[PDB]
Amino acid sequence: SIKTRIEEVQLQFLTGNTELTHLKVSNDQLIVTTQRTIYRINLQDPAIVNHFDCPLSKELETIMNVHVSPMGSVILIRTNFGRYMLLKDGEFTQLNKIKNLDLSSLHWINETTFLMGIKKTPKLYRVELTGKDITTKLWYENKKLSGGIDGIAYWEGSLLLTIKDNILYWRDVTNMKFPLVLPDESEQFERLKHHAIKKFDSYNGLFAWVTSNGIVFGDLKEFGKFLSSSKVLLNFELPDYLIKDIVLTAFHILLLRKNTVTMVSQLNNDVVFHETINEKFLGLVRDSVKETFWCFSNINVFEIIIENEPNSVWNLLV
Amino acid sequence: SIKTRIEEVQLQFLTGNTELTHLKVSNDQLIVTTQRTIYRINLQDPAIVNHFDCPLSKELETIMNVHVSPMGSVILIRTNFGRYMLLKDGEFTQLNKIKNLDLSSLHWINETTFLMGIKKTPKLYRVELTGKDITTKLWYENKKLSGGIDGIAYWEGSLLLTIKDNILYWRDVTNMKFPLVLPDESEQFERLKHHAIKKFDSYNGLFAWVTSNGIVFGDLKEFGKFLSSSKVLLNFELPDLIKDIVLTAFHILLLRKNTVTMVSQLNNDVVFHETIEKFLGLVRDSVKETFWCFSNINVFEIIIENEPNSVWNLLVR
């Protein structure tokens, strides 16, 4: 039997005024940002709070996106003035080679490498960090399609992309011709036509994609029927029935709607948790190293504490 | 810069009399055993201690081996009288189909499935738990070789086995003929000829094998040269007999008499070496990526900070 509950996290360092804009958690390091400042706290020794003033030239410049490597070694920051910079061991490195680049999606493959989609065009690039700079390579383009890549998953050669209604799958890209153009398989699902924080998530080769009619999900870890074997959790399976965010756990899926969090089993669509928490909710967050889960608003951070997850589904794994 | 230290863990449930024999940690659940009792503690709430009395028929019967699934859902217990039983949600199920089986190695693939080697013979079997019982399938045999399988690693179809001096590798077993017999590649390294707690470990597709001259290690995540591309940390690279080995994300933990050494996988740098009653194992929580070591009286946490950050400059190609 699974036990879930939500607990507020005390963030004294902030002050009654200051507002949160992003949260990431990696390897027990909690990373919160305001408009201009990046705070790092070791959850094993809270009370030590480090902070890093983003070196923002200009007055109206603020932090727009925060991308953290799976294990927390690198923090890639984008400002609303198009500047990209690495924050590493307390120092910022500017990446002038991509100034003003507009991304629709970014997905880390490891501590030095990520895949990125450019907005409004179906092109995917692999980016490798060298320390001072980056190298690039075109992985995918198809001009017959339109829209930007919104969803990216990669596991051991297997690649998954979403572009509007299309989900595109390659079994193993590693010995194929580049750039990739036509996938091994593709499916169409009526897309979610409304702004969300995220409509797609992956973890451990697992993937989940929010669409108009429900969530499509599966597991890249496992002929011509991969996509067709995907599972769905349909809207009428959910309590009180717009999904703003999604995060995968080992065996469940976390969904943010307005101000409620729902937890649903990946094995049989069972709703195991559903709860409510001026204050606007801004994301669901996973620490992929520690397998902990979080959500946050413009004023607060909360931990979604899960107990007995594996034990609760063992009978269904056999 | 990496920060490592060792901290004793307070285990009140024990007291002066009874000794520890096994420790596993999985999904923040700490599992310690004595001769006859199994204790489970949630590290997030340590004052709640659950215990389970192993249903030991006979007086001289005690717990010999404890095998816990990667995420903690199942606890497989072997007694010194040959009995195998599952402990799950507070209840024991006997597995009479394998009573008196003698294993050289056991490696979990998932929460219901493990690979096992039988002692003194080069045969590997896949075992699947059904709840009440098991099913079996022969994965590998080769009668030309001798000794039991001592080391097993499996990642996404890739299989690694050690049999005495041989390390055997298959790229992808999933569409191959069973039983497996000849590997895609094989190498020989003079084996460690002395009892150890473990001579082989794997994690996240990473593998490490203690041999006479050093530790051979690598990464199944990545033609005909896989094994040859393995790295070595040689004995003369170490400060100052290796009894146990545990892989971390980017380092290797080694137990010797009563000292723990931590060595980098990326450049063999000794980043930690410290002394800490007989020491019985190194342990990893593969869900939480925490590390531990224990003796017959105490449990210690090996607390690591800044590991990824400490090696980032070396990850760049």
XYZ file of C-alpha atoms in Angstrom:
635
model
C 0.000 0.000 0.000
C 1.388 3.324 -1.248
C 1.472 6.373 1.031
C 1.591 9.845 -0.507
C 1.473 13.256 1.144
C 2.473 16.836 0.374
C 4.662 18.787 2.768
C 5.612 22.445 2.579
C 9.327 23.147 2.501
C 10.522 26.074 4.629
C 12.661 28.440 2.526
C 13.694 31.067 5.077
C 16.371 32.611 2.843
C 13.753 34.291 0.600
C 12.011 37.198 2.479
C 8.260 37.847 2.541
C 8.371 39.803 -0.718
C 10.574 37.719 -3.031
C 8.891 35.545 -5.691
C 10.000 32.180 -7.108
C 10.138 31.600 -10.848
C 11.899 28.209 -11.221
C 12.747 25.147 -9.200
C 14.995 22.222 -10.065
C 16.221 19.442 -7.802
C 19.198 17.268 -8.642
C 21.287 14.930 -6.506
C 19.684 16.399 -3.337
C 20.634 19.903 -4.453
C 17.632 22.185 -4.552
C 17.892 25.011 -7.063
C 15.364 27.840 -6.810
C 15.442 31.057 -8.812
C 13.785 34.393 -8.490
C 13.884 36.988 -11.289
C 17.629 37.577 -10.809
C 19.093 35.213 -8.220
C 19.859 31.504 -8.173
C 19.837 29.754 -4.799
C 21.373 26.314 -4.217
C 20.641 24.380 -1.038
C 21.899 20.915 -0.087
C 18.877 19.109 1.240
C 21.159 16.992 3.460
C 22.354 20.183 5.150
C 19.755 22.803 4.742
C 20.713 26.039 6.577
C 23.750 26.299 4.271
C 22.334 28.433 1.482
C 24.489 29.511 -1.425
C 23.367 32.138 -3.894
C 24.536 33.320 -7.259
C 23.533 36.656 -8.721
C 22.930 36.070 -12.403
C 25.289 38.584 -14.075
C 22.417 40.437 -15.701
C 23.431 43.340 -17.872
C 20.414 45.646 -18.385
C 17.580 46.462 -15.981
C 14.689 44.499 -17.550
C 16.796 41.351 -17.919
C 15.653 38.396 -15.826
C 15.985 34.613 -15.754
C 13.653 32.875 -18.198
C 14.666 29.220 -18.283
C 16.786 27.011 -16.066
C 18.104 23.691 -17.373
C 20.000 21.431 -14.983
C 21.925 18.334 -15.991
C 20.487 15.043 -14.727
C 23.028 14.847 -11.854
C 23.274 18.550 -11.057
C 26.839 19.220 -12.287
C 25.826 21.955 -14.729
C 23.185 24.706 -14.615
C 22.336 26.244 -17.996
C 20.547 29.591 -17.661
C 18.650 31.522 -20.343
C 17.618 35.144 -19.829
C 14.718 36.970 -21.378
C 17.308 38.930 -23.399
C 18.456 35.754 -25.197
C 21.707 35.194 -23.284
C 22.761 31.624 -22.451
C 25.223 30.953 -19.659
C 26.593 28.011 -17.679
C 26.726 28.220 -13.936
C 29.336 25.761 -12.661
C 31.104 25.653 -9.299
C 30.018 29.247 -8.598
C 31.113 30.785 -11.908
C 29.195 31.865 -14.995
C 30.380 31.143 -18.525
C 28.585 32.957 -21.359
C 27.726 30.917 -24.460
C 27.771 33.600 -27.141
C 27.496 31.061 -29.938
C 23.787 30.617 -29.134
C 22.803 34.137 -28.096
C 19.097 34.741 -28.963
C 18.487 31.101 -29.879
C 14.837 30.291 -29.308
C 14.171 26.737 -28.158
C 10.945 24.725 -28.073
C 12.552 21.855 -26.148
C 15.768 20.773 -24.431
C 16.526 17.286 -23.145
C 19.817 16.251 -21.459
C 21.410 12.984 -22.526
C 24.221 13.190 -19.945
C 26.250 15.754 -17.976
C 27.783 17.326 -21.099
C 25.266 16.718 -23.850
C 21.690 17.699 -24.708
C 19.255 17.593 -27.594
C 17.424 20.763 -28.536
C 14.505 21.739 -30.716
C 14.266 25.198 -32.218
C 10.916 26.970 -31.980
C 8.405 26.752 -34.866
C 10.583 24.443 -36.974
C 10.970 20.620 -36.959
C 14.771 20.538 -36.523
C 16.630 18.760 -33.705
C 20.297 19.458 -32.815
C 22.700 17.679 -30.528
C 24.741 20.056 -28.365
C 27.922 19.060 -26.519
C 29.455 21.324 -23.881
C 33.255 21.696 -24.006
C 33.580 23.910 -20.881
C 34.228 27.226 -22.640
C 31.948 26.552 -25.607
C 29.756 24.094 -27.486
C 29.783 21.926 -30.611
C 26.623 21.123 -32.597
C 25.254 18.511 -34.957
C 21.923 18.280 -36.825
C 20.120 15.134 -35.699
C 16.731 15.549 -37.356
C 14.864 17.660 -39.862
C 11.676 17.256 -41.854
C 10.277 20.257 -43.734
C 7.064 18.372 -44.668
C 5.964 18.753 -41.028
C 5.294 21.985 -39.179
C 5.593 23.250 -35.611
C 8.522 22.929 -33.266
C 9.576 19.768 -31.405
C 7.780 19.953 -28.016
C 8.670 16.518 -26.592
C 12.035 14.692 -26.544
C 12.986 11.314 -25.068
C 16.215 9.416 -25.608
C 17.217 6.013 -24.195
C 20.183 3.898 -25.359
C 19.888 4.829 -29.029
C 16.065 5.024 -28.986
C 14.628 8.445 -29.801
C 11.106 9.780 -29.373
C 9.871 13.186 -30.620
C 6.528 14.999 -30.545
C 5.696 17.636 -33.148
C 2.100 18.883 -32.827
C -0.122 15.750 -33.251
C 2.760 13.488 -34.295
C 4.860 11.233 -32.113
C 7.906 9.904 -33.923
C 10.007 6.914 -32.866
C 13.360 5.509 -33.778
C 14.451 2.149 -32.336
C 18.170 2.782 -32.567
C 19.541 5.942 -34.177
C 23.186 5.112 -33.428
C 23.993 3.404 -36.778
C 21.517 5.302 -38.950
C 22.083 8.085 -41.499
C 22.051 11.675 -40.200
C 20.148 13.867 -40.271
C 17.224 11.651 -39.351
C 14.076 12.385 -41.410
C 11.575 9.490 -41.411
C 11.086 7.570 -38.133
C 10.772 3.814 -37.757
C 7.198 4.478 -36.553
C 4.859 7.438 -36.131
C 1.411 7.947 -34.629
C -1.086 10.793 -34.459
C -2.948 11.944 -31.350
C -5.063 15.111 -31.191
C -2.697 17.449 -29.372
C -3.444 19.436 -26.292
C -4.289 22.881 -27.700
C -3.738 25.058 -24.660
C -0.611 26.411 -22.986
C 0.882 23.983 -20.447
C 4.072 24.196 -18.371
C 5.062 20.841 -19.904
C 3.102 18.394 -22.042
C 5.833 15.726 -22.141
C 8.152 14.016 -19.690
C 10.580 11.134 -19.645
C 12.478 9.248 -16.968
C 14.495 6.065 -16.992
C 13.386 5.424 -20.636
C 9.748 5.929 -19.590
C 7.766 8.589 -21.475
C 4.460 10.345 -21.102
C 2.724 12.828 -23.366
C -0.346 14.886 -22.527
C -2.760 15.096 -25.442
C -6.311 16.394 -25.916
C -7.998 13.097 -24.997
C -5.593 11.794 -22.351
C -2.010 10.856 -21.559
C -0.120 8.556 -23.829
C 2.703 6.724 -22.065
C 5.138 3.842 -22.325
C 8.681 2.620 -21.913
C 11.523 2.778 -24.417
C 13.236 -0.094 -22.522
C 10.468 -2.293 -24.092
C 8.490 -4.836 -34.074
C 6.899 -1.915 -35.913
C 4.337 -1.871 -33.093
C 6.172 -0.013 -30.364
C 4.057 3.119 -30.523
C 0.881 1.102 -30.908
C 1.677 -0.747 -27.655
C 1.651 2.609 -25.802
C -0.724 2.863 -22.852
C -3.329 5.620 -22.401
C -4.849 7.201 -19.340
C -7.936 8.910 -20.735
C -9.527 12.095 -19.362
C -12.656 10.334 -18.159
C -10.462 8.073 -16.031
C -9.420 11.068 -13.922
C -11.198 12.497 -10.896
C -13.248 15.669 -11.542
C -13.756 14.875 -15.267
C -6.818 21.338 -17.852
C -3.523 19.478 -17.219
C -0.673 22.043 -16.837
C 2.282 19.737 -15.982
C 3.308 16.094 -15.776
C 6.076 14.188 -14.034
C 6.885 10.512 -14.203
C 7.727 8.475 -11.116
C 9.065 4.924 -11.213
C 5.578 3.395 -11.398
C 3.099 6.321 -11.426
C 2.363 9.648 -13.063
C 1.981 12.999 -11.278
C -0.395 15.565 -12.814
C -0.851 19.227 -11.961
C -4.244 20.870 -12.666
C -5.048 24.372 -11.428
C -4.021 23.758 -7.814
C -4.513 19.975 -7.399
C -1.998 17.122 -7.729
C -3.174 13.721 -8.930
C -1.113 10.536 -8.836
C -1.993 7.720 -11.221
C -0.531 4.240 -11.587
C 1.307 3.354 -14.806
C 0.353 -0.293 -14.392
C -3.439 -0.087 -14.206
C -4.556 3.599 -14.280
C -5.528 3.562 -10.584
C -5.833 6.980 -9.035
C -3.858 6.547 -5.866
C -3.719 10.213 -4.815
C -5.699 13.380 -5.475
C -5.371 16.542 -3.402
C -5.614 20.317 -3.367
C -2.720 22.387 -2.017
C -3.239 34.765 -5.388
C -0.706 31.839 -5.189
C -0.124 30.287 -8.650
C 1.416 26.825 -9.224
C 4.352 26.743 -11.589
C 5.584 23.148 -11.870
C 6.044 19.537 -10.892
C 9.697 18.593 -10.379
C 11.642 15.300 -10.098
C 15.135 14.718 -8.683
C 16.150 11.971 -11.121
C 19.111 10.916 -8.969
C 17.257 10.644 -5.665
C 13.818 9.828 -7.018
C 12.134 12.563 -5.000
C 9.282 14.709 -6.214
C 8.252 18.287 -5.724
C 5.877 21.025 -6.773
C 6.081 24.793 -6.434
C 4.195 28.036 -6.699
C 5.310 31.663 -6.959
C 5.582 31.701 -3.135
C 6.124 28.120 -1.881
C 7.917 24.865 -2.477
C 6.340 21.534 -1.502
C 7.675 17.993 -1.361
C 5.489 15.161 -2.666
C 6.539 12.398 -0.296
C 5.890 8.879 -1.582
C 6.314 5.700 0.502
C 6.088 2.062 -0.496
C 5.766 2.673 -4.219
C 7.524 -0.521 -5.460
C 5.880 -2.658 -2.806
C 2.482 -1.282 -3.710
C 2.727 -2.507 -7.352
C 4.713 -5.752 -6.990
C 1.668 -7.971 -7.507
C 1.161 -6.230 -10.884
C 4.762 -6.635 -12.087
C 4.569 -10.473 -12.187
C 35.770 19.215 -5.309
C 34.316 16.011 -3.835
C 33.610 15.727 -0.104
C 33.455 12.276 1.491
C 33.027 11.282 5.127
C 31.882 8.319 7.178
C 29.178 8.669 9.828
C 28.004 6.052 12.280
C 24.327 5.242 12.139
C 22.567 4.785 15.506
C 20.662 1.449 15.553
C 18.947 1.264 18.886
C 16.896 -1.828 18.022
C 19.960 -4.061 18.487
C 21.642 -3.620 21.931
C 24.917 -5.062 23.353
C 24.117 -8.746 22.805
C 23.184 -9.529 19.256
C 25.319 -9.044 16.167
C 24.622 -7.930 12.650
C 25.178 -10.400 9.809
C 23.731 -8.607 6.739
C 22.783 -5.130 5.592
C 20.912 -4.004 2.508
C 19.540 -0.573 1.682
C 16.905 0.017 -0.928
C 14.683 2.993 -1.629
C 15.647 4.527 1.759
C 14.634 1.297 3.496
C 17.432 -0.082 5.577
C 17.380 -3.850 6.060
C 19.619 -5.344 8.741
C 19.648 -8.989 9.858
C 21.010 -10.827 12.816
C 21.207 -14.644 12.967
C 17.408 -14.987 13.160
C 15.682 -11.590 12.807
C 15.189 -9.149 9.945
C 14.802 -5.436 10.779
C 13.416 -2.835 8.345
C 13.766 0.878 9.012
C 12.677 3.796 6.893
C 15.584 6.179 6.878
C 13.168 9.094 6.486
C 11.568 8.093 9.811
C 14.191 6.042 11.734
C 12.406 5.665 15.103
C 9.853 3.322 13.496
C 11.502 -0.066 13.478
C 9.718 -3.090 12.041
C 11.026 -6.583 12.622
C 10.320 -9.992 11.169
C 11.299 -13.230 12.891
C 12.578 -15.601 10.210
C 10.409 -18.734 10.646
C 13.363 -20.944 11.440
C 12.531 -24.578 12.064
C 15.424 -26.220 13.960
C 17.759 -24.703 16.552
C 21.002 -24.413 14.546
C 19.201 -22.787 11.613
C 20.167 -19.156 10.899
C 20.034 -16.630 8.071
C 22.895 -17.155 5.620
C 22.170 -14.845 2.658
C 19.837 -11.901 2.052
C 18.999 -10.776 -1.477
C 16.886 -7.659 -1.945
C 15.414 -6.493 -5.195
C 16.870 -3.253 -6.606
C 13.924 -1.154 -5.340
C 13.252 -3.021 -2.091
C 9.908 -4.702 -2.942
C 11.095 -8.253 -2.301
C 13.469 -9.780 0.225
C 14.772 -13.260 -0.617
C 16.228 -15.093 2.382
C 18.422 -18.232 2.395
C 19.113 -20.170 5.582
C 22.105 -22.293 6.422
C 19.781 -25.314 6.188
C 19.180 -24.646 2.446
C 15.702 -23.101 2.750
C 14.742 -20.191 0.469
C 11.886 -17.866 1.373
C 10.396 -14.539 0.235
C 9.608 -11.901 2.762
C 6.996 -9.546 1.315
C 4.669 -7.134 3.096
C 5.425 -8.845 6.418
C 4.827 -12.443 5.321
C 7.155 -15.315 4.437
C 6.625 -17.571 1.440
C 8.744 -20.760 1.225
C 10.241 -21.636 -2.173
C 10.515 -25.417 -1.916
C 11.396 -25.751 -5.574
C 14.941 -24.571 -4.783
C 15.502 -26.070 -1.346
C 19.243 -26.823 -0.876
C 20.256 -25.035 -4.065
C 23.793 -23.766 -3.752
C 24.465 -20.495 -5.580
C 27.751 -18.869 -6.570
C 26.067 -15.636 -7.683
C 22.672 -13.870 -7.859
C 21.967 -10.672 -9.776
C 18.531 -8.982 -9.964
C 17.331 -7.763 -13.330
C 14.130 -6.212 -11.966
C 11.672 -6.572 -9.092
C 10.552 -10.062 -10.142
C 13.518 -11.525 -11.983
C 17.098 -12.538 -11.221
C 19.956 -14.418 -12.807
C 21.704 -17.083 -10.779
C 24.848 -19.133 -11.016
C 25.123 -22.529 -9.367
C 28.285 -23.305 -7.418
C 31.184 -25.139 -9.101
C 29.486 -25.343 -12.505
C 29.336 -22.841 -15.418
C 25.545 -22.704 -15.733
C 23.402 -19.564 -15.497
C 19.619 -19.651 -14.937
C 17.004 -16.934 -15.169
C 14.515 -17.057 -12.307
C 11.183 -15.262 -12.355
C 9.100 -14.905 -9.199
C 5.355 -15.504 -9.611
C 4.398 -14.692 -5.988
C 3.805 -18.244 -4.756
C 6.555 -19.861 -6.823
C 9.200 -19.463 -9.504
C 9.789 -20.370 -13.141
C 13.276 -21.110 -14.497
C 15.124 -21.030 -17.747
C 18.704 -22.008 -18.625
C 20.483 -18.930 -19.989
C 24.027 -20.191 -20.272
C 26.113 -23.315 -20.063
C 29.577 -24.267 -21.213
C 31.065 -27.559 -20.040
C 34.487 -26.764 -21.578
C 34.989 -24.264 -18.731
C 35.187 -24.982 -15.023
C 34.265 -23.209 -11.795
C 31.057 -21.418 -10.938
C 29.926 -18.016 -12.211
C 31.163 -15.456 -9.624
C 30.278 -12.184 -11.414
C 27.090 -11.169 -13.250
C 26.123 -7.912 -14.933
C 23.157 -7.291 -17.183
C 22.213 -4.081 -19.000
C 19.577 -3.786 -21.723
C 20.355 -7.106 -23.366
C 24.112 -6.923 -22.660
C 25.439 -9.672 -20.407
C 28.740 -9.998 -18.613
C 29.923 -13.073 -16.687
C 33.068 -14.012 -14.777
C 34.127 -17.637 -14.380
C 37.509 -17.964 -12.679
C 39.982 -16.030 -14.932
C 37.453 -15.540 -17.748
C 35.221 -12.577 -18.337
C 32.580 -13.257 -20.965
C 30.559 -10.630 -22.851
C 27.468 -10.621 -24.995
C 26.364 -7.415 -26.743
C 22.676 -8.313 -26.968
C 21.343 -11.672 -25.800
C 17.670 -10.811 -26.407
C 17.374 -12.240 -29.940
C 20.002 -14.968 -29.595
C 19.662 -18.724 -29.276
C 19.386 -20.131 -25.711
C 21.191 -21.496 -23.884
C 24.053 -19.117 -24.561
C 27.440 -20.911 -24.912
C 30.104 -18.829 -26.717
C 30.221 -15.078 -25.949
C 30.719 -12.290 -28.450
C 34.040 -11.584 -26.636
C 36.071 -13.075 -23.791
C 39.204 -12.010 -21.888
C 41.442 -13.583 -19.258
C 42.692 -11.886 -16.077
C 44.527 -13.719 -13.257
C 41.747 -14.077 -10.712
C 41.865 -13.056 -7.094
C 42.647 -16.331 -5.305
C 41.500 -15.520 -1.796
C 38.066 -15.330 -0.161
C 36.372 -11.931 -0.549
C 32.882 -10.732 0.441
C 32.400 -9.770 -3.229
C 34.846 -9.609 -6.142
C 32.376 -8.125 -8.638
C 29.836 -5.353 -8.714
C 27.637 -3.565 -11.214
C 25.461 -0.467 -11.236
C 23.721 1.477 -13.961
C 25.441 -0.722 -16.606
C 28.823 -0.048 -14.972
C 30.873 -3.072 -13.859
C 33.946 -3.706 -11.775
C 35.836 -6.918 -11.106
C 38.566 -7.428 -8.537
C 41.371 -9.594 -9.905
C 44.867 -10.557 -8.707
C 46.612 -7.584 -10.301
C 43.906 -4.917 -9.928
C 40.293 -3.929 -10.651
C 39.003 -4.248 -14.136
C 36.078 -1.911 -14.824
C 33.961 -0.417 -17.550
C 30.497 0.471 -18.768
C 28.053 -1.688 -20.706
C 26.292 1.529 -21.906
C 29.435 1.977 -24.137
C 33.112 -3.616 -32.127
C 34.734 -6.834 -30.906
C 36.853 -4.627 -28.625
C 34.474 -3.921 -25.775
C 36.310 -5.976 -23.206
C 39.684 -4.743 -24.424
C 38.562 -1.138 -23.866
C 38.046 -1.951 -20.151
C 39.897 0.241 -17.661
C 42.148 -1.022 -14.875
C 43.039 0.352 -11.479
C 46.189 -1.605 -10.622
C 47.268 -2.613 -7.106
C 50.287 -0.343 -7.087
C 48.002 2.629 -7.756
C 46.389 2.133 -4.342
C 47.548 3.594 -1.028
C 49.423 1.174 1.254
C 43.688 -7.682 0.432
C 40.494 -6.247 -1.120
C 37.446 -7.851 0.584
C 34.577 -5.890 -1.078
C 33.817 -3.439 -3.859
C 30.930 -1.071 -4.608
C 30.449 1.160 -7.611
C 29.277 4.757 -7.286
C 28.251 6.913 -10.243
C 31.829 8.040 -10.938
C 34.041 6.282 -8.333
C 34.770 2.916 -6.774
C 34.617 2.093 -3.058
C 37.006 -0.582 -1.731
C 37.009 -2.310 1.638
C 40.317 -3.682 3.004
C 40.635 -5.024 6.556
C 39.111 -1.916 8.230
C 39.794 0.911 5.729
C 37.618 2.336 2.960
C 39.238 3.756 -0.171
C 37.411 5.755 -2.836
C 38.908 5.872 -6.330
C 37.810 7.775 -9.420
C 36.582 5.818 -12.453
C 37.747 8.554 -14.760
C 41.442 8.821 -13.846
C 42.248 6.451 -10.942
C 42.602 9.329 -8.438
C 42.396 8.258 -4.848
C 39.973 10.806 -3.470
C 39.379 9.188 -0.062
C 41.208 6.745 2.215
C 40.247 6.235 5.852
C 40.182 3.815 8.750
C 36.955 3.290 10.685
C 34.770 -5.384 15.430
C 34.944 -7.045 11.961
C 33.782 -5.348 8.730
C 31.289 -7.293 6.679
C 30.404 -5.277 3.586
C 30.047 -2.206 1.432
C 26.447 -1.466 0.430
C 24.688 0.739 -2.166
C 21.089 1.955 -2.247
C 20.696 1.859 -6.039
C 17.483 3.934 -5.906
C 18.799 6.756 -3.729
C 22.483 6.510 -4.674
C 23.648 6.349 -1.073
C 26.479 4.244 0.251
C 27.109 2.331 3.422
C 29.443 -0.030 5.200
C 28.883 -2.274 8.205
C 30.548 -4.421 10.813
C 29.216 -7.094 13.187
C 28.275 -4.252 15.597
C 27.809 -1.007 13.628
C 26.412 0.507 10.479
C 28.048 3.546 8.860
C 26.979 5.871 6.072
C 29.539 6.889 3.475
C 28.347 10.409 2.738
C 29.477 11.807 -0.634
C 28.985 15.437 -1.779
C 29.704 17.138 -5.102
C 30.545 13.908 -6.929
C 29.313 14.896 -10.446
C 30.672 18.420 -10.114
C 34.058 17.070 -9.062
C 34.500 15.131 -12.344
C 32.770 17.364 -14.911
C 36.020 18.595 -16.467
C 36.896 14.944 -17.160
C 33.575 14.034 -18.802
C 34.140 16.382 -21.764
C 35.126 14.091 -24.674
